[PDB]
């Protein structure tokens, strides 16, 4: 591909959604351009996937591979880089880093969210060695183990409660006295005999050999610090969506700062799509499945909108 | 599984939409059992399957053994016959030959039936060169003569991808008007490639190990005439599940599918639906959309269950 050159649409990002809509598109013979930073987007900090049906118990670093081949066989051109910009105009103008300018009839967003970190010793030291940052993913793979769950809100309520359906224990560590998730969620969790709440704490440092062994807390009230023993800790606190790149570009967000799009994908700008996390459809539920499906949608709504065009 | 036994969620259907919600339902630890009644539902009538992110060109067959290998790694009990009715007394799930079972909640992933056209060689060349979704294997006939039976949205979508691919397409449709969308009409009507064959039926297909041609008849004149075809792609239609839906008191929308909201939930609480039997993404029948949709209804499943 030459800096210039227009594409019938122009994918950004490279996580499971962008590639979802690559295979679309291309199936669609839509002239394609995937223009994305990391290959995998988050699958890169994923250990075994077990939850995208038909791909059993395979290594995160492997679906990635097969994903990329597997649009590499209609040969979509990717490049790997980051846009900078995305220009309305009759066409499309996307600036990259470096890469260049390219132009496009229709554009699809796969650009993510930025999952929120606690910030402490430890949390990359052990990242994929008993830290993980989705329960829902990896609950199954601590059965009869101690873990800790952290934050406050729907996702660490949640998952607590799916990991107290396969540990022996599940500490709930959140620095405040009340929780802004659901109470329903909170009163379910509260009654099971297995999770043990630990609130107004937050963690201090994480700890372990080879992998995670304990995880330090401190209480923000009493000051006190204290070590519990776990195999697993479970970081749910949130996550940062793109609201900034699409104020930046003229694109309507949500109530929550995410892409706002309708059923089919489609964003506030005609021509403009959106897929997988960085969007306002099932907020909340974060999947390897649901992201590439939605790319199949959004490669679908930009294929009706450039072939009406 | 025993007649009377009591599980937390029961999926009917055994479609990818099926398999689908079963292993997001054993992940969330819920007590699952499926009950469909043909393995792998519409990917028995499929071929090579190059459309769901991960599995290049896999043979539908194929596809189905994994898929069920997937739940099974799960332990989730698959009961093969056919659900009668679902009764709220929770839920009791009744089959044909089976028995009842208990639920207290149900998922249902019973797709659609394709609308049957029943012409002379349909069998006869059943994977030989006729199949029943254009998008799905257009760029199998890439350079090749094709003829597209409909005159709906999927005949005229399909005939929109196929004259990309493909060398010609005939569009022959049995009215002299097209129930699909004017913009759809219109931008295959710009296609040079694509000859419209109105007012006109198939009376049969034809060929030696695969299909060779396609007889053709005008119902306005009787003349009838040979077309040669390397591929018949026939997008008449399905029938949605609408009276089983309302046989059980399940709201249907004006094309006679289940109503689902956002996350699949149906007019009755406690029932989810996932896959083509739903009004979500309407007409687009994909396995990769079927299957998400059963992942989303199985954790509205866990979220009614465990709140319940
Ligand atoms: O699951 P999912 O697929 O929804 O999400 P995901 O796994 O988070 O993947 C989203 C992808 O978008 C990429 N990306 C983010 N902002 C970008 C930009 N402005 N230009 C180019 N690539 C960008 C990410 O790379 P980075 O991680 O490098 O931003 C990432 O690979
Ligand atoms: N309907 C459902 O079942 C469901 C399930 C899961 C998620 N969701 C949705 O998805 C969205 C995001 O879910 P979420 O719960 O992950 O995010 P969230 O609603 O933002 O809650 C996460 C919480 O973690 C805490 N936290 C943040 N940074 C922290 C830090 N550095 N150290 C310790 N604690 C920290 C915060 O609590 P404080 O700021 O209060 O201290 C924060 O609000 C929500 O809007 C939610 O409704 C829905
Ligand atoms: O794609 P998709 O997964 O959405 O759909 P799909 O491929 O059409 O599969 C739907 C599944 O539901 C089954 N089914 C339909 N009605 C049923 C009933 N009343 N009781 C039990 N099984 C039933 C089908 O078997 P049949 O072939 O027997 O309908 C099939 O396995
Ligand atoms: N919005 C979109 O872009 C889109 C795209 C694809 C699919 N869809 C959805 O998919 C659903 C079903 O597919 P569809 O729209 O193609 O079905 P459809 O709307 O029923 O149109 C198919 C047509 O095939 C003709 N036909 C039926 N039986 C026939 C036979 N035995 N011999 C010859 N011709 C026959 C019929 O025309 P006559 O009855 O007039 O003869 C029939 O209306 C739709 O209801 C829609 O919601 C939507």
Same mark, same amino acid.
Do not use: W
């Given at each position: 591909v030459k800096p210039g050159e227009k594409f019938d649409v122009i994918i950004?990002?490279?996580?499971?959604?962008?590639?979802?809509?690559?295979?679309?598109?291309?199936?669609?013979?839509?002239?394609?351009?995937?223009?994305?930073?990391?290959?995998?987007?988050?699958?890169?900090?994923? @250990?075994?996937? $077990?939850?995208? *049906?038909?791909?059993? =118990? !395979?290594?995160? #670093?492997?679906?990635? %591979? +097969?994903?990329?081949? /597997?649009?590499?066989?209609?040969?979509?051109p990717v490049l790997l880089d980051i846009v900078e910009k995305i220009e309305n105009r009759d066409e499309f103008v996307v600036k990259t880093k470096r890469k260049g300018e390219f132009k496009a009839d229709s554009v699809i967003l796969g650009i993510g969210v930025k999952r929120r970190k606690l910030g402490v010793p430890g949390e990359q030291e052990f990242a994929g060695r008993g830290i993980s940052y989705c329960s829902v993913?990896?609950?199954?793979?601590?059965?009869?183990?101690?873990?800790?769950?952290? @934050?406050?809100? $729907?996702?660490? *309520?949640?998952?607590? =409660? !799916?990991?107290? #359906?396969?540990?022996? %224990? +599940?500490?709930?560590? /959140?620095?405040?006295?009340?929780?802004?998730?659901?109470?329903?969620?909170?009163?379910?969790?509260?009654?099971?005999?297995?999770?043990?709440?630990?609130?107004?704490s937050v963690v201090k440092e994480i700890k372990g050999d080879k992998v995670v062994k304990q995880v330090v807390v401190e209480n923000l009230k009493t000051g006190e610090i204290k070590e519990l023993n776990v195999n697993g800790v479970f970081i749910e606190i949130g996550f940062d969506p793109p609201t900034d790149f699409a104020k930046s570009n003229g694109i309507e967000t949500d109530t929550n700062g995410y892409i706002k799009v309708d059923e089919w994908m489609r964003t506030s700008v005609p021509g403009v799509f959106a897929a997988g996390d960085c969007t306002s459809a099932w907020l909340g539920f974060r999947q390897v499945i649901t992201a590439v499906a939605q790319g199949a949608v959004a490669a679908t709504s930009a294929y009706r909108y450039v072939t009406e065009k």
């Open positions: 950004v990002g490279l996580g499971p959604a962008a590639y979802g809509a690559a295979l679309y598109s291309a199936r669609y013979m839509l002239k394609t351009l995937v223009i994305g930073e990391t290959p995998g987007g988050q699958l890169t900090e994923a @250990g075994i996937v $077990d939850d995208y *049906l038909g791909l059993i =118990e !395979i290594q995160a #670093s492997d679906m990635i %591979k +097969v994903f990329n081949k /597997h649009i590499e066989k209609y040969e979509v993913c990896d609950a199954p793979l601590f059965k009869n183990r101690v873990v800790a769950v952290i @934050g406050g809100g $729907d996702s660490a *309520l949640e998952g607590a =409660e !799916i990991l107290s #359906s396969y540990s022996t %224990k +599940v500490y709930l560590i /959140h620095r405040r006295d009340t929780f802004k998730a659901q109470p329903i969620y909170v009163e379910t969790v509260k009654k099971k005999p297995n999770v043990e709440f630990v609130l107004n």
